[PDB]
Amino acid sequence: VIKSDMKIKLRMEGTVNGHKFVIEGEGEGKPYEGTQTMNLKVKEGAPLPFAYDILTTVFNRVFAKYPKHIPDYFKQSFPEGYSWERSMTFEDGGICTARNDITLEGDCFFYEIRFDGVNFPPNGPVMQKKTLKWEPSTEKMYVRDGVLTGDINMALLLEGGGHYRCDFKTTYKAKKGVQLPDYHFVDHCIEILSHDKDYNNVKLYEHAVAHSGLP
Amino acid sequence: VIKSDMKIKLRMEGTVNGHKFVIEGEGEGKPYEGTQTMNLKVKEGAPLPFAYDILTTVFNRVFAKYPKHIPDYFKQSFPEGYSWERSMTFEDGGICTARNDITLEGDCFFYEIRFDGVNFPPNGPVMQKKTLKWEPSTEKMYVRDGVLTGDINMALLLEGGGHYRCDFKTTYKAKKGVQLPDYHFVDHCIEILSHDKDYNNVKLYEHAVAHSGLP
Amino acid sequence: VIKSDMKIKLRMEGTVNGHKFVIEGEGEGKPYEGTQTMNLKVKEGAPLPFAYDILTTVFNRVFAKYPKHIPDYFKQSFPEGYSWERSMTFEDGGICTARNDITLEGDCFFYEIRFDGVNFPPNGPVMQKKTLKWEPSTEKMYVRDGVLTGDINMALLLEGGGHYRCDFKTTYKAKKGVQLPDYHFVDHCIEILSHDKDYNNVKLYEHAVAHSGLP
Amino acid sequence: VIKSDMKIKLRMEGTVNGHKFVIEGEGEGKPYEGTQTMNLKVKEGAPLPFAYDILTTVFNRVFAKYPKHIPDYFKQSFPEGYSWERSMTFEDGGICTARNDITLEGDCFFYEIRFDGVNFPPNGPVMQKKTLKWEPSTEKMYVRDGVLTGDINMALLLEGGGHYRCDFKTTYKAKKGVQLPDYHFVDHCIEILSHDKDYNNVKLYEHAVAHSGLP
Ligand SMILES: [Mg+2]
Ligand SMILES: [Mg+2]
Ligand SMILES: [Mg+2]
Ligand SMILES: [Mg+2]
Ligand SMILES: [Mg+2]
Ligand SMILES: [Mg+2]
Ligand SMILES: [Mg+2]
Ligand SMILES: [Mg+2]
């Protein structure tokens, strides 16, 4: 079902500040190593007039290395799979909502994604494309109403220094009964490995590892 | 351009808790009296599995009575028109994003609307359809970055008593240069006048009046 | 008990950005007209290194004109009286907490107030004393857990234009059983009538009127 | 200056839900190991009518193990020292503000602490003393306006299961010039080791370690 090497295909449809776009992706990862890489292409709405980094964490917690002592909500959910929904609340009032419905056929995951962003200041770092990268982060995972919730204090590093803060809340919903984990953490690191001038073509990497804190 | 009687046509496409839907509407209003009525029909995704009230304030501040001493951002923007974007932050973590692009042809306004909702608790009043109505409200309007922003403390009255709080932030963007108003308020009252069992058919009314506070 | 003319005495002890202070006040108001005036004097910590306006709304909803159709939580609570607690959440991360225990002896109200402010940016309008006034506002009043809660979208007008947003949540607790009101509003307007150079001496006025919205 | 073994003395004055109290503490820690233990005694306001856990993280990032590659803001600030201010924003609307002014004499740290809590629901876990412990956490540390800010997604584990979420923002201010760190993390774990029936006497432990994320 979930093998050492898996492929990924995705389509994202979205609107940010009223600008409509479609992004398609293909990639590969190692679910048990917690690593993955994706090649993304803008199919409609090029050139994007906003910072590409707001999209990157929307482009699957299957790709997270879970130790034996923490139930793995995500890997347990397949073959049936799971979906997630997310809000991204930025410190200057920008708010994004996103969702991913993740299905599995053979060795390929398919992602149906929707992304919407509103209320970004026109002179802020998102609409002025002044972001460099997301910093690494630690997601706090806990069960609430029988499903799994993840909260994250995120930060974008900005051109010229300084950070731009965003708070993530993701709800994750398994499509079958699975053993629920106790409170735990997932450390993440996401990076754009390469892109062309207007980010019409982007190569993206993530590494993620689950853990129980200090210790 | 904006006459004493105007017609309204709209299409809303949206997703709430992963449930996809399309709603079309036709209505009429009196821009200078600040009143309007709309007939809405669910075209795809019936029956809606969530509280219809979360949608109602997305179904145009042209329909607000502005006194002579407050510049009317909305009426001034036509014929070119305006668009708005909104976030709706509910007290139990549910978040909606919405947008409306408002165009005018002859005596008919046309609304292109997108609505997305995420992170609603499955036993909350929205997914359990336990809301009765929005209470009246007062929107705080102020200019920020050369465009108009409206903040609102909203509340849904619940079955069995009690309120469910939501905070609105709307940004309004004119498609041409207009005279900007000083800080002011818009009082609103929105009501569902009638509906059928699953809200496949709904008649909706709003009254709105701008003012400068106490006095 | 609560007469057409009432006197007010107060002492505020507080800390903002680590700066300790004491302010004493004496004033008078007309509870049934919804108006009041106060003379305030800094007794310790002069000169205050922050914008005086953050304090003003802490210096009693007895002074609000309630119409016959809305139960008056505040006037009903006396002679025993009531206390309130408030949070003030500013858009740049500054947060204040405040409380007032309001007692009545004869024709004089006595206020025991505590005020604490934290996390104000050193180059923000509060620590740079760049605020001009609070705009008028409308408080949303509703019952939650058998006591009364008030939420307010507030805004300070800034030197050189622009607004600085703050969100108030106040809980009001009667010291005896009183008839609880349905959802309603209180319009407010607060103004500094005069002050000396470092605001060691300030004369302050408020007008407040309760109402049920549109209508 | 900061030695392998240091002593700690503190006094906290505070008010929660209008209840006034004083807590004094004495303890010891190992700054370079990131560990510390404290004995706390209620001196005024016993028995506390609220969950003791809301106080525990207010009872000094000197006690955090910093690796060689991350500048240590806290240890660098002495002998002059530093102060911090914090807001604690709970998911049910409860808000606390706190501050600590940390001075050093010989081998003993002295803490002057103020704590204020407001707007806790009377049937919530704080006023009903239904909390068991804080979960471990990871603080996100970043420089903003030349001083250090820490944000934390915190959670209290509740009696009968479930979590109660709180968001911390702490600002840390050195009393002299120090080398500023790049974005980093501090993992924490705080535990009550023992207490008597009404928590008049409490023994508290914390372990904290700084790091740069994944890796
Ligand atoms: Mg936008
Ligand atoms: Mg969020
Ligand atoms: Mg939902
Ligand atoms: Mg909002
Ligand atoms: Mg401060
Ligand atoms: Mg607040
Ligand atoms: Mg309280
Ligand atoms: Mg906070």
Which residues of chain D are within 8 Å of residue A144 when distances are taken between CB atoms? 162-163
Contacts of A122 in chain B (CB under 8 A): 145, 147
Amino acid of residue B152:
I
R_g of chain A, CA atoms, integer Å: 17
Residue D8 sits at φ, ψ, to 5 deg, of -140, 130
Q: Residue D73: phi, psi to the nearest 5?
A: -50, -40
User: Encoding tokens for residue A74?
Assistant: 């995500």
For chain D, what is the domain count? 1
| Alpha-carbon distance A62 to nearest alpha carbon in chain D (angstroms) | 18
Asked if B111 contacts B11 with a C-beta cutoff of 8 angstroms, the reply is yes
CA distances from D206 to B89, D112, D197 (A): 35, 19, 22
Centre of ligand 7 from the C-alpha of residue D59, in Å: 20
Question: Per the structure block, which two tokens stand in for A123?
Answer: 């002179």
d(CA A15, CA B14): 12
Q: Does D191 touch chain A (CB under 8 A)?
A: no
Task: Identify the experimental approach.
Answer: X-ray
Q: Which residues contact A46 (CB under 8 A, 6 or more apart)?
A: A21, A198, A200
Spatial CA neighbour of D53 closest among D181, D154, D146, D161: D154
> For residue D164, what are the β-bridge partners?
D156
Specify whether the CB–CB gap between B212 and B42 falls below 8 A: no
Hey, are the CB atoms on D213 and A136 less than 8 Å from each other? Answer: yes
Phi-psi region of D68 (alpha: psi -120 to 50; beta: other; left: phi over 0): alpha
- DSSP-assigned states of every residue in B125-181: TTTTT-EEEEPPEEEEEEEETTEEEEEEEEEEEETTS-EEEEEEEEEEEESS--PPP
β partners of residue D131: D158
Q: How many angstroms does the Cα of residue A109 sit away from the middle of ligand 8?
A: 38
As given in the structure block, the two tokens for residue B174 are: 């004119």
Residue A161 per-residue DSSP state: S
Q: What is the three-class DSSP state of B99? A: strand
d(CA A32, CA A30): 6
- The answer to whether residues A57 and A134 touch, using CB atoms and an 8 Å cutoff, is yes
Q: Which residues precede a break in chain A, with C-to-N distance above 2.5 Å?
A: 59
The total number of residues shown for chain B amounts to: 215
Q: Is D138 on the interface with C (CB under 8 A)?
A: no
Q: Residue A162 has which token pair?
A: 């300084």
Partnered with residue C156 across adjacent β-strands are: C134, C164
Query: Is the separation of the CB atoms in C137 and B140 below 8 Å?
Result: yes
Three-state secondary structure along chain C?
CCCCCEEEEEEEEEEECCEEEEEEEEEEEECCCCEEEEEEEEEECCCCCCCCHHHHCCCCCCCCECCCCCCCHHHHCCCCCEEEEEEEEECCCCEEEEEEEEEEECCEEEEEEEEEEECCCCCCCCCCCCEEEECCEEEEEEEECCEEEEEEEEEEEECCCCEEEEEEEEEEEECCCCCCCCCEEEEEEEEEEEECCCCCEEEEEEEEEEECCCC
- Which residue of A142, A155, A208 is in closest CB contact with D142? A155
Instruction: List phi, psi (to 5°) of C107.
Output: -110, 15
DSSP chain D: ---SSEEEEEEEEEEETTEEEEEEEEEEEETTTTEEEEEEEEEESPSPSS-THHHHTT--TTSSB--TTS--HHHHTTTT-EEEEEEEEETTS-EEEEEEEEEEETTEEEEEEEEEEE---TTSTTTTT-EEEEPPEEEEEEEETTEEEEEEEEEEEETTS-EEEEEEEEEEEESS--PPPPSEEEEEEEEEEEE-TTSSEEEEEEEEEEE-S--
**d(C-alpha C32, C-alpha C114), whole Å:** 27
Asked if residues D204 and D59 have their Cβ atoms less than 8 Å apart, the reply is yes
Whether C92 and chain D come into contact, CB under 8 Å, resolves to no
| Residue A182, SS3 per DSSP | coil
Backbone breaks in chain B after residues (C–N over 2.5 Å): 59
Which of A18, A99, A121 lies nearest to residue B18, judging by beta carbons? A99
Task: Check CB contact of B211 with chain C, cutoff 8 Å.
Answer: no
Q: What is the CATH number of the domain that holds B26?
A: 2.40.155.10
C67 part of contact set with chain B, CB < 8 Å:
no
Spatial contact of C209 and C187, defined as CB atoms under 8 Å apart: yes
Between CA C79 and CA C43 the distance in angstroms is: 30
Report the C-alpha dihedral over residues C189, C190, C194, C200, rounded to 10 degrees. 180
Residues D58, D6: Cα–Cα separation, whole Å: 18
Distances (CA, A) of C53 to B81, C44, D140: 38, 18, 32
- Tokens for B170, please give them: 């709307």
Cβ under 8 Å to D: C residues 151-190: 169, 171
Dmax (CA) for chain D in angstroms is 48
Q: What is the 3-state secondary structure (H, E, C) of B100-114?
A: EEEEEECCEEEEEEE
First vs last C-alpha separation in chain A: 32
* Inter-chain CB proximity B213 and C137 less than 8 Å: yes
Q: In whole angstroms, how far apart are CA C101 and each of B190, C95, C174, D36, D50?
A: 38, 21, 10, 38, 19
Question: How far is the CA of C161 from the CAs of B43, B146, C133, in angstroms?
Answer: 47, 12, 11
Q: Measured between alpha carbons, how far is B124 from D14 in angstroms, rounded to an integer? A: 35
Name the helix (H) or strand (E) containing B29: strand B19-30
Q: Which residues pair with D36 in a beta bridge?
A: D29, D206
Instruction: Name residue, tokens 């010291």.
Output: C175
Name the 3-class secondary structure at A121.
Answer: coil
Neighbours of A1 (CB within 10 A): 9
Q: How far is the CA of B122 from the centre of ligand 3 (A)?
A: 8
- Whole-angstrom Cα distance, residue D77 to residue C46? 28
d(CA C41, CA C24): 5
Task: Say if CB C13 and CB C113 are below 8 A apart.
Answer: yes
Q: Which amino acid is at B153?
A: N
State which residue of chain B sits closest to A100, comparing Cα positions: B18
Q: Chain B residues with CB inside 8 Å of A119's CB?
A: 85-87, 169, 171
Is D143 an 8 Å CB contact of chain C? no
What whole-number distance in Å separates Cα of residue C167 and Cα of residue D68?
42
**Distance between A131 CA and the closest CA of chain B, angstroms:** 20
Task: State the best of C118, C169, C175 to mutate against chain D, taking most chain D CBs within 10 Å.
Answer: C118
Which of A114, A121, A122 is facing B15, going by the closest CB pair? Answer: A114
B14 CB near a chain A CB, below 8 Å? no
A97 vs B: CB within 8 A: yes
What is the resolution of the experimental data for this entry, in Å? 1.8
The pair of three-digit structure tokens given for residue A100, joined into one six-digit string: 């991913």
Q: How does DSSP classify residue A119?
A: -
Instruction: Please state whether beta strands D6-16 and D108-118 pair in parallel, antiparallel, or not at all (unpaired).
Output: parallel
- CA–CA separation, C86 and C84 (whole Å): 7
CA distances from B10 to A16, B13, B61, B102, D214 (A): 21, 10, 15, 9, 49
A56 by DSSP, 3-state: which? helix
Residues in chain C: 215
Q: How many CB atoms lie within 10 A of CB B42?
A: 20
Q: Amino acid letter at C182?
A: D
Asked if A116 has any chain B CB less than 8 Å from its own CB, the reply is yes
Cβ count within 10 A of residue C213 = 16
Q: Mapping DSSP to helix (H, G, I), strand (E, B) and coil, where does residue B55 land?
A: helix
Query: Which domain covers residue D193, as residue numbers?
Result: 1-215
The answer to whether D91 contacts chain A (CB < 8 Å) is no
Say if CB B75 and CB B148 are below 8 A apart: no
Q: Which residues of D95-115 are buried (b: 16+ CB within 10 A; e: fewer)?
A: bbbbbbbbbbeeeebebebbb
- D157 and A207 within 8 Å at the Cβ level: the answer is no
Q: Which of A118, A145, A151, A167 to mutate to test the interface with B (most CBs of B within 10 A)?
A: A118
Does the beta-carbon distance from A98 to B118 stay under 8 Å? yes
**All residues at 6 or more sequence positions from C52 whose CB lies less than 8 Å from its CB, including other chains:** C129, C192, C195, C199, C202
d(C-alpha A186, C-alpha A63), whole Å: 11
Residue in this structure with the two tokens 């408020």, named with its chain if needed: C206
CB < 8 Å to D157, chain A: 183
Is the distance from CB of A59 to CB of A192 less than 8 angstroms? no
Beta-carbon contacts of B146 under 8 Å, excluding residues fewer than 6 positions away, are B180
- How many beta-carbon pairs below 8 A join chains C and D? 74
Minimal Cα–Cα distance from B155 to chain C, Å?
9
In terms of Cβ atoms closer than 10 Å to its own Cβ (0-12, 13-18, 19+), residue A18 is middle
| B100 touches A at CB < 8 Å | no
Ligand nearest to the CA of D173: 5
CA distance B193 to chain A (A): 30
The C-alpha atoms of residue C119 and residue C14 are separated, in whole angstroms, by 15
**To the nearest whole angstrom, how far is the Cα of D167 from the nearest Cα of chain C?**
12
Rounded to a whole number of angstroms, the distance from the CA of B132 to the nearest CA of chain A is: 24
